[PDB]
Design a protein around this ligand. Structure first.
Ligand SMILES: O=C(O)c1ccc(Oc2ccccc2)cc1
Length: 115
């Protein structure tokens, strides 16, 4: 239940990304985690996702909203290195090159506020 980086060593995280490059070359390896202090939104069922590289960040927002089963009254923000993604209709492939972690994953955090 701890964050991903506390459950896998840096070496193991790098290895995982390299494996994903071999097995699913057209996908972006993503870690999506609930903000540390979040109180309203539920937890996702899982944290690691393989995203086809053509998916827009703004579509990813709508997909995650559906996966959390949110009403249209529930606020939801998806942040990548503190940047909100709701209006970024750019493919994740381009965000990946810019925002990837040193371990090769693309990390995101979701919250009910955009701080
Ligand atoms: O358009 C697709 O086919 C596709 C496939 C996988 C995706 O990854 C997810 C799925 C749910 C939540 C977070 C990431 C997103 C889109």
């Amino acid at each position: 239940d701890r964050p991903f980086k506390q459950r896998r060593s840096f070496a193991d995280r790098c290895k995982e990304v390299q494996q994903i490059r071999d097995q699913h070359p057209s996908k972006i390896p993503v870690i999506i985690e609930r903000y540390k202090g979040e109180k309203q939104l539920p937890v996702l069922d899982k944290t690691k996702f393989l995203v086809p590289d053509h998916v827009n960040m703004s579509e990813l927002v709508k997909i995650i909203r559906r996966r959390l089963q949110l009403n249209p009254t529930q606020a939801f923000f998806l942040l990548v290195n503190q940047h909100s993604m709701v209006s970024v209709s750019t493919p994740i492939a381009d965000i990946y090159e810019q925002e990837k972690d040193e371990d090769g994953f693309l990390y995101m955090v979701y919250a009910s506020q955009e701080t």
